[PDB]
Amino acid sequence: TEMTAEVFDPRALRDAFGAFATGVTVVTASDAAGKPIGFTANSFTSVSLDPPLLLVCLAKSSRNYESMTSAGRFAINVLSETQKDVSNTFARPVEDRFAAVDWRLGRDGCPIFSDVAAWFECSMQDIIEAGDHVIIIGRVTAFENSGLNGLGYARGGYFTPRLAGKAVSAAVEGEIRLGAVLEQQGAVFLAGNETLSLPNCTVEGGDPARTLAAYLEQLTGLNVTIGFLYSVYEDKSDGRQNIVYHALASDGAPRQGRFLRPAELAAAKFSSSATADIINRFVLESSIGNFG
Amino acid sequence: VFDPRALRDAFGAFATGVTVVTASDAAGKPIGFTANSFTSVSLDPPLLLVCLAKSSRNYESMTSAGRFAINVLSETQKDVSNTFARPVEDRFAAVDWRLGRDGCPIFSDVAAWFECSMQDIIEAGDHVIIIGRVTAFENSGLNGLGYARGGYFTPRLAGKAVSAAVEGEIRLGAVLEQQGAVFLAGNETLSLPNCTVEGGDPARTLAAYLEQLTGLNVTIGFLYSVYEDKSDGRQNIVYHALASDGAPRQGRFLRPAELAAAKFSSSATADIINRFVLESSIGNFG
Numbered sequence: 001t002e003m004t005a006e007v008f009d010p011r012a013l014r015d016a017f018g019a020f021a022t023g024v025t026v027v028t029a030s031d032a033a034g035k036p037i038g039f040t041a042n043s044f045t046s047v048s049l050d051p052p053l054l055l056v057c058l059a060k061s062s063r064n065y066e067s068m069t070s071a072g073r074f075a076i077n078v079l080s081e082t083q084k085d086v087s088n089t090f091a092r093p094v095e096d097r098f099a100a101v102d103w104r105l106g107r108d109g110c111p112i113f114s115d116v117a118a119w120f121e122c123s124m125q126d127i128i129e130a131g132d133h134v135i136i137i138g139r140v141t142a143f144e145n146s147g148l149n150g151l152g153y154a155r156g157g158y159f160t161p162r163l164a165g166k167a168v169s170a171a172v173e174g175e176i177r178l179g180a181v182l183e184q185q186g187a188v189f190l191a192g193n194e195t196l197s198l199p200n201c202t203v204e205g206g207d208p209a210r211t212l213a214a215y216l217e218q219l220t221g222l223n224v225t226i227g228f229l230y231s232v233y234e235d236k237s238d239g240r241q242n243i244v245y246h247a248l249a250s251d252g253a254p255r256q257g258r259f260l261r262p263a264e265l266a267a268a269k270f271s272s273s274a275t276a277d278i279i280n281r282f283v284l285e286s287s288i289g290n291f292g
Numbered sequence: 293v294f295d296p297r298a299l300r301d302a303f304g305a306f307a308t309g310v311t312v313v314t315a316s317d318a319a320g321k322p323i324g325f326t327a328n329s330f331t332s333v334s335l336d337p338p339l340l341l342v343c344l345a346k347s348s349r350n351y352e353s354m355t356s357a358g359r360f361a362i363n364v365l366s367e368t369q370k371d372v373s374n375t376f377a378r379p380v381e382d383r384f385a386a387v388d389w390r391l392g393r394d395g396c397p398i399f400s401d402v403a404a405w406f407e408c409s410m411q412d413i414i415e416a417g418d419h420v421i422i423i424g425r426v427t428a429f430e431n432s433g434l435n436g437l438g439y440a441r442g443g444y445f446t447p448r449l450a451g452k453a454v455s456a457a458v459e460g461e462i463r464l465g466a467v468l469e470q471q472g473a474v475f476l477a478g479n480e481t482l483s484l485p486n487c488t489v490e491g492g493d494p495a496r497t498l499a500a501y502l503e504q505l506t507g508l509n510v511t512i513g514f515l516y517s518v519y520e521d522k523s524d525g526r527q528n529i530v531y532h533a534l535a536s537d538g539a540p541r542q543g544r545f546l547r548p549a550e551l552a553a554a555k556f557s558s559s560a561t562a563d564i565i566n567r568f569v570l571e572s573s574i575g576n577f578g
């Protein structure tokens with residue numbers, strides 16, 4: 001009597017929601033047995049100041065769904081720049097998630113993580129049914145705010161204020177190799193056939209994003225948008241400073257190279273260990289995120 | 293029980309994008325508001341969330357509307373965000389916009405936009421939770437305007453900074469906040485705290501400088517502004533920063549109220565202070 005048929009492309013919609021940048025939280029609580037349970041959530045909002053109200057959304061598909069909705073108290077841990085691993089641990093299917101964080105129990109028995117950007121001890125007010133998820137509303141009972149910069153998530157992956165500084169230091173040291181994790185759908189652009197390499201060009205001076213956008217657009221014949229810094233490092237083998245950006249390509253077949261889905265990258269040979277590390281990160285940050 | 297500033301500042305730790313919720317009132321006139329307390333709720337059915345203060349002027353018009361739209365602003369749309377947070381007579385004069393298939397104001401050059409139908413309005417304290425079912429949407433690859441802690445951040449600035457850094461020496465400045473007070477050096481002619489260097493991590497350098505200067509603990513945040521001083525000729529990298537509690541060794545933390553008839557070191561310094569006081573008179577909650 002209701003219409004069970006796809007209207008929008010789940011990828012297209014998920015990617016559109018991704019345009020709105022968010023920080024990263026880890027929702028924590030204790031199950032019926034008193035065992036700490038948790039999950040990474042970026043679908044969080046500050047609701048009211050008087051009374052102190054907060055919001056977070058949990059998928060009905062969650063393993064912890066029953067334990068969570070049944071819990072009376074929960075805590076929101078707003079992760080800092082250095083807590084990329086916590087976000088991954090608490091989003092990935094791991095045996096003991098709480099073994100990846102230094103944590104303690106709050107005044108109201110909720111797992112509070114250390115070195116976080118901010119944390120909030122809550123009491124559940126209401127659980128609102130909303131599609132494939134539920135809206136959990138909590139009343140802030142206790143909180144703390146360290147000046148600590150928070151871990152961010154925009155579009156594909158994480159961003160941190162840290163990297164801008166790291167990039168500037170590298171840029172002054174000498175020439176930089178400007179690389180990019182250029183995504184089409186969920187497919188990363190890679191140059192070569194037998195030994196795949198990320199698109200890059202080594203320059204000294206100018207706006208790295210402007211330079212890289214021009215290079216990529218020329219290379220692929222596609223329209224490109226350079227986003228947040230992905231990684232800044234010194235190649236241990238090469239010796240060269242490396243500035244890697246997260247980027248997006250318009251639809252179509254590129255002039256040269258190809259866009260590969262994580263499934264195709266499984267048994268692929270890479271230009272360098274660094275290149276492989278970045279691809280490993282891309283495929284892992286592809287196996288995670290809100291919705292399916 | 294809780295300090296509204298302390299709590300507001302704690303919520304601010306969680307970065308967001310910047311949306312402009314739009315609709316048409318009973319008279320059919322376009323209405324809108326800047327909102328950052330937005331969340332993607334469900335994929336099947338497509339569900340979305342945005343919070344509106346009960347104190348809002350448009351509160352009655354909004355809750356009474358059946359359809360609305362979400363405008364996920366891009367990096368270049370700081371001033372759109374400002375217009376729609378501030379009380380101006382013609383807000384819609386500040387944006388190139390059109391009406392969507394369901395008669396909602398859709399802005400051009402946005403990072404993404406969502407056309408919705410109201411599903412429910414949930415009462416939640418000094419605000420209401422508006423739930424919308426997506427009827428249409430569009431996503432340009434465009435980077436979004438971001439809001440973390442006291443102000444805006446954009447991916448743009450990282451690149452802008454790197455270009456400047458390679459050109460030569462940079463003046464590293466900071467919008468260093470204590471409570472709602474910005475740190476300023478000098479007595480008659482106030483200047484933002486800064487030091488000119490060539491090489492190293494600008495954030496590391498600035499944290500060291502500020503901590504030494506003030507005798508306070510500092511956290512350097514997102515890039516605030518990158519520009520070339522028109523008078524000086526010097527490249528300027530300005531960071532958003534935070535100071536621990538207490539009186540600084542030198543200089544002083546001034547409230548927007550105290551800055552009103554204050555003389556500044558340069559027009560640029562004044563532009564940044566103007567921006568600080570304006571992005572102080574805006575943000576979620578009153």
Ligand SMILES: Cc1cc2nc3c(=O)[nH]c(=O)nc-3n(C[C@H](O)[C@H](O)[C@H](O)COP(=O)(O)O)c2cc1C
Nearest residue numbers: 039040041042043057058059062063064091289290
């Ligand atoms: C950045 C990011 C944001 C996420 N946001 C949410 C969210 O808001 N709600 C949700 O249910 N899952 C979210 N997830 C995925 C979950 O953490 C996780 O896979 C699962 O729902 C919790 O594990 P469980 O099934 O064992 O409870 C997110 C993952 C990432 C990386």
